[PDB]
RNA sequence: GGUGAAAUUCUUGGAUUUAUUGAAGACUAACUACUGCGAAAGCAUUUGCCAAGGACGUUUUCAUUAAUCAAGAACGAAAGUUAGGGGAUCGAAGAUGAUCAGAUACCGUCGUAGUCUUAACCAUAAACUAUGCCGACUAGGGAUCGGGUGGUGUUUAUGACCCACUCGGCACCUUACGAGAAAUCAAAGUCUUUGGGUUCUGGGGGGAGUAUGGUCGCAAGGCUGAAACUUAAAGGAAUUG
């Protein structure tokens, strides 16, 4: 009935972007980003930019003929900050607002059995 | 400037008949053309789905299953088992402090000529009329229950060929087998498998595969 | 009455000042 | 008695060829002249004939190990990973 | 035949064309590593002692 | 409290404590009567047992050792000796 | 001189256990030094669960959550976490409220 | 286990050492419970187990090699085989398979 | 890409992202605590082998076999040295673009030794059980680890938990009658109402842990270790601006 896709929303610091693709994962559909909107290099992860990218991505999905999505939220992971970026909530909210069915939400931020020590040295980023 | 939305073609995956309702989505793959088109060359696209809406259930966001496409026919391509897993919601909901954590892992050779790895996760709890805060174990009971769990989880396999092993797994019979197998230590406890994965699929097995068609 | 917490860090952690006519000019 | 203090086997070369060189040569010459043991002899009997060619004089055969040692770390690692991959292919 | 071996295998005296009877990695202590396979148009990717 | 009859302190106070800390240290072990279920012999045995005790003739089993007290495991005979 | 009874951290006959890194600055520290704070709230903004329910089926199906524990350092802990009162006598507090 | 087991054997019962004596005992039929090493040659191994089949005895493949077999028997030399020709005070030859 | 702001850098030769498959070496998250073990340094994946060890139970055994130590030896984080192997990430040097004017600051990127291991070497070092070692005593309360004892015990007639006692241990709260300069301490107490036994350290600060000698190390330095001359104070706890 309702044809699925996967959103693959990846949010971090100084960027966030959506990568809609098929259920298999090897045939993308309209990878778009919030960094394409405003060329400031300081608000690349903003809610307004993420919402603009969300409108563009939902437009591509509706024009292609997709109706349902599974959202997957990603951060830098591994050793990095591990937190979801700020724009992901605005992105998925615009996706819901765009009249697209959404189901089976989960987080896929990678997590190790720890290794590969973080940068910054022992003392860290001494700002 | 190709505009490949018009170029690509729609296919419907089809889960095997060792399952409930098996129509489980559609894919936009590529153009079915001449000069070595890829529609009859993909043969390996893997899809991640939920057992719950696979069966029509409505209250299990966990125990997701993945399936690989094996062959294509009639623009309607049949899949086969590739592995299973849990969602990080339930696992990290179950995990908390002031309790312990048991893990076991077997790498078993089944009846048909497959080998696959299987996991087994468990925790602990507190009996009634309790006063204690934490309820940790003795670190020898842990080895004992790990031993009996690995024994049971290699006993079910090597015997219970993969096709029916999935059908015995999806009702979660093995968990409630362990719960009343080691009832002497704990009448009820929260056990799960949490992971299965194949390594060495030897041969396509078109015969049995088309026997389990849907 | 232990006093081992004053026994790891803050006197020598490179013993080339103890082997000082080796590498440092 | 204990004749030499530091040079050991390399006293034949004498006072010459440096010292950092004729300690490396010592390191390798103890190895190439030492005896080792084959499990299929059971005993410490193997000895070098030439570079890469060692001989178990019990069990009466030859093996093609390293130049100054009967086996190398690289050889052992490849033996282990082949034991791994053969077991993986057959299972 | 180095198409019928797994990845990461370690070999020597490998042929560069099938029939040359041994070209590469036949010096003392030298080998050659299997990086990847390519069953279609059959080939294999391989790493030599010079990197 | 802190002043009592140290000539003979109370029973509940002298029983609950460890054996060495008593005014006069004494044992908490004993012997007992035990009957082989197979044979007839009602022999004696230590309470805090050790390596496997069995009957003299119909040697099958009497009591299995543990960290503290042993266990006859079926209700045969355990009173005194 | 004498600031704290448990001077650095919770080390009673252990010598040396293991280090970890700070999340903010990634300073290598011991494990139980400053604070290891929990993070379980949700994956949910200003709620919008009405939006999710109308844009879902079997509405929202999970109430899914994030789960982590994060090890701060005092160079970053008091700077980010603000508790607003560190007296002498209230150095022995244990209840967050 | 096997080591204290055949230690009890050399204490109480009767054994014999080496390929020649073992073969003589197997031929006489006064033998049972042949233990062989691991590093023994395959030819000797094969003919030994063939004679063992002909005589209806029990073969045990010592997971260790030669020196450790000698030490387990208690002797200060390499020994490839043993034949337990009597275990009058033992539970070895019946319990081991 | 990365930041508070940047650039240095990569990329339509298809970067970034996405799905499968593989290799490398490294590490063992969450569980992880007022938890445990070890003489210390220190020790968290599974199983197996090798030996080891504390506590508990004991109506087993030996009968002073013991406590502490010069000297002489064992072990001894990390960083370093020798030769090899390996070298995924981080990264002392070093190159790079930018900010408080510049950065040889901080910062972003890259990156050599190193970070892993094999056989040796170095062995003093901000390594407090918040306090050398062994023995008796002196307040209360609770939690908890390993045993040991019993129960109307509770739970499918010990199976799994609770209650009470007890030995040993890591810790916590109160109060100190005692002590202390105070912080504070159940030991830092049982000390001028001064003595249970044993080992090592210091007599103002600097000069000085430097000279000189010995000895050790792969190394005009480890370990041991002065003086000339000096100022009148340095130093510890606690109060107040
Ligand atoms: Zn041999
Ligand atoms: Zn940090």
Coordinates of C-alpha atoms in Angstrom, one line a residue, chain F residues 2-80:
Chain F
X2 CA 28.6 -3.0 81.1
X3 CA 28.4 -4.8 84.5
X4 CA 27.3 -8.4 84.5
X5 CA 28.0 -11.8 86.2
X6 CA 31.5 -12.5 84.8
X7 CA 31.6 -15.6 87.1
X8 CA 29.0 -17.1 84.8
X9 CA 27.7 -14.8 82.1
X10 CA 24.3 -15.5 80.6
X11 CA 23.5 -18.5 78.3
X12 CA 22.2 -16.5 75.4
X13 CA 25.3 -14.2 75.6
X14 CA 27.8 -17.0 75.8
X15 CA 26.2 -19.2 73.1
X16 CA 25.8 -16.7 70.3
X17 CA 29.4 -15.8 70.2
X18 CA 32.4 -17.4 68.4
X19 CA 34.1 -20.4 70.0
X20 CA 37.5 -18.8 70.6
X21 CA 36.2 -15.5 72.2
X22 CA 34.4 -17.4 75.0
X23 CA 35.7 -17.2 78.6
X24 CA 36.7 -20.8 78.1
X25 CA 36.9 -21.8 74.5
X26 CA 35.2 -25.0 73.5
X27 CA 33.9 -26.9 70.5
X28 CA 30.7 -26.7 68.5
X29 CA 31.3 -30.0 66.7
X30 CA 30.3 -33.5 68.0
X31 CA 29.7 -37.1 67.0
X32 CA 26.5 -38.8 66.2
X33 CA 24.9 -42.2 65.6
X34 CA 24.4 -43.3 61.9
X35 CA 22.9 -46.5 60.5
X36 CA 23.8 -47.9 57.1
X37 CA 20.5 -48.4 55.3
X38 CA 21.9 -51.4 53.5
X39 CA 23.7 -53.1 56.4
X40 CA 22.6 -53.2 60.0
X41 CA 25.6 -51.5 61.6
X42 CA 24.8 -48.3 63.6
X43 CA 28.2 -46.7 63.8
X44 CA 29.5 -43.4 64.9
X45 CA 30.9 -40.5 62.8
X46 CA 32.1 -37.0 63.0
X47 CA 29.7 -34.1 62.6
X48 CA 31.8 -31.6 60.6
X49 CA 32.9 -34.5 58.4
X50 CA 35.7 -34.8 55.9
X51 CA 36.5 -37.1 52.9
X52 CA 33.9 -39.7 52.0
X53 CA 32.6 -41.9 54.9
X54 CA 30.8 -45.1 53.9
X55 CA 29.8 -48.3 55.6
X56 CA 32.2 -50.9 56.8
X57 CA 30.8 -53.9 54.9
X58 CA 27.9 -52.6 52.7
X59 CA 30.0 -49.6 51.7
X60 CA 27.7 -47.4 49.6
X61 CA 27.4 -44.0 51.2
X62 CA 26.7 -42.4 54.6
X63 CA 27.5 -38.6 54.5
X64 CA 28.9 -36.2 52.0
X65 CA 31.3 -33.4 53.1
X66 CA 30.8 -29.7 52.7
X67 CA 32.3 -26.5 54.0
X68 CA 30.8 -26.8 57.5
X69 CA 28.4 -29.6 58.4
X70 CA 28.0 -32.7 56.3
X71 CA 24.7 -34.2 54.9
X72 CA 23.4 -37.8 55.3
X73 CA 20.8 -36.9 52.5
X74 CA 18.1 -39.3 53.6
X75 CA 16.7 -39.3 57.1
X76 CA 18.3 -42.4 58.4
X77 CA 19.6 -41.9 61.9
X78 CA 21.1 -38.8 63.5
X79 CA 20.7 -38.3 67.3
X80 CA 23.9 -38.4 69.4

